[PDB]
Structure 1
Amino acid sequence: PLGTEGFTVIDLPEVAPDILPSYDRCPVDDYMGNGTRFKRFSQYKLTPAEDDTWSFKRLPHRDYTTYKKFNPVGGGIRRVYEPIEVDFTPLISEGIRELGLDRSEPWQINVHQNRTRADGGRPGPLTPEGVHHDGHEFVMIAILNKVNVAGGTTRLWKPGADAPFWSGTLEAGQAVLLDDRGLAHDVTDVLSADGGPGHRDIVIIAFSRWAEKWYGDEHDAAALEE
């Protein structure tokens, strides 16, 4: 599973040919990134299956809701996103295998398909939350494509620390897996590499046990403080 410090970086297998083009059809994120971000969103149930396998079931499509206490800029509100068109589950399976997800109970995942654009004079913010926890138990962040960008450096932090203990610029074909409770993270802004437009296409998977799922009326009421 995860390394001693609570994170691992892995290489990803080749992706299906429809995955990278699908980022061109993600609509603008109306809630984050102030026009620099484009997004689709889907949620799944993860059930340990017969054999040492995991079965994915896409859940009925719902608005994304998170807590203000984890996300001060995009928490506490209903975030209406379009569903993800492509199938990320083979890539997610790689993260499940590296995590050694506990098979004693089922899991629920949030899947964020994000493109962030940068241009000369206008960086693309990746974590306007600042140093943060996403609020889940494990998080997988996979880089699918980068074009003409600098910056975008992932930094891992122990709670309370003045500086990160690990930093690295994740490249296309890499993913980081992290203990989202024991570590916090941020990422530096995407910059234009040459003064012209550039972009960074990623998928973020947030893992929670089904018994603490981030899905349904009860979760929504808590995140929205209703």
Structure 2
Amino acid sequence: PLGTEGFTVIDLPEVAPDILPSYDRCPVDDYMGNGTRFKRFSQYKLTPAEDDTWSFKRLPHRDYTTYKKFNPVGGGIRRVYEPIEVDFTPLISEGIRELGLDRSEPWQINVHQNRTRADGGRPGPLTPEGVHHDGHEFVMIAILNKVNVAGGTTRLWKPGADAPFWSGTLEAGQAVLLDDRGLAHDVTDVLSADGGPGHRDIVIIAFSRWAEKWYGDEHDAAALEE
């Protein structure tokens, strides 16, 4: 499973030819990033399959809801996103293999397909939450494309620490897997590499056991404090 410090960085396999172009068709995120972020969102059930594989089932499309206690800037509201068009589940299966997810019960994943844009004088913020936990058990963050950007350095923190214990800029074709309970994280802003427009295209996958799923009326009521 994960490295002893609670994270692993991996190389990603080649992706299908529809993945990178699909980022050009992500609409603006009306809730986060103040116009610098573009997003699609889908959720899946993840079940252990015989032959020691995993089965993915796309769930009916629902608004994204998270808790203010994890995300103070985007929590506590219904966030209406459009579904992801392409199939990230081959990519996600690489992360699962490295996580060694507990096969004794089913899992539920949130999948966020994000583009953040940077331009001269306007960095693209990646973690306006600051140093945070996502609220899930594991998180996978995969970088699919970077064009004309600098910055975007991932920092991993022990809870309460004054400084991160690991920093690294993930490049296209890399992913980090995180123990999202034991570690906190942030990412420095995306910067324009030369003064002109640039962008950073990623997918974030948040893993929870189905028994603790971030999906459905009970989760929504809890996250919205209803």
User: TM-score by structure 1 length?
Assistant: 1.00
Residue aligning to 2:55: 55
Q: Secondary structure at the match of 1:207?
A: strand
Q: Distance in 2 between matches of 1:49 and 1:195?
A: 49
Q: Secondary structure at the match of 2:202?
A: strand
CA deviation profile, 1:91-134 (whole Å, cap 9, x unmatched): 00000000000000000000000000000000000000000000
Q: Which runs of 5+ in 2 are unaligned?
A: none
Residue aligning to 2:125: 125
Q: Distance in 2 between matches of 1:51 and 1:64?
A: 33
CA deviation profile, 1:166-217 (whole Å, cap 9, x unmatched): 0000000000000000000000000000000000000000000000000000
Residue aligning to 2:225: 225
Alpha-carbon offset, residue 51 of structure 1: 1.3
Q: Distance in 2 between matches of 1:173 and 1:23?
A: 15
* Aligned Cα root-mean-square deviation (Å): 0.2
CA deviation profile, 1:151-174 (whole Å, cap 9, x unmatched): 000000000000000000000000
Q: Distance in 1 between matches of 2:114 and 2:104?
A: 31
Q: Secondary structure at the match of 2:94?
A: helix
Q: Distance in 2 between matches of 1:146 and 1:3?
A: 26
Residue aligning to 2:189: 189
Residue aligning to 2:33: 33
Q: Which runs of 5+ in 1 are unaligned?
A: none
Q: Secondary structure at the match of 1:218?
A: helix
Alpha-carbon offset, residue 72 of structure 1: 0.3
CA deviation profile, 1:36-66 (whole Å, cap 9, x unmatched): 0000000000000111000000000000000
Q: Distance in 2 between matches of 1:224 and 1:54?
A: 31
Q: Distance in 2 between matches of 1:125 and 1:100?
A: 31
Q: Distance in 1 between matches of 2:172 and 2:190?
A: 14
Q: Distance in 2 between matches of 1:51 and 1:211?
A: 24
Q: Secondary structure at the match of 1:131?
A: coil
Q: Secondary structure at the match of 2:208?
A: strand
CA deviation profile, 1:13-56 (whole Å, cap 9, x unmatched): 00000000000000000000000000000000000011100000
Name segments (4+ residues, structure 1) moved above 4 Å.
none
Q: Distance in 1 between matches of 2:197 and 2:72?
A: 28
Q: Distance in 1 between matches of 2:26 and 2:159?
A: 34
Q: Distance in 2 between matches of 1:74 and 1:26?
A: 19
Q: Distance in 1 between matches of 2:166 and 2:57?
A: 34
Q: Distance in 1 between matches of 2:77 and 2:63?
A: 9
How many corresponding residue pairs? 226
Query: Is 1:206 aligned with 2:206?
Result: yes
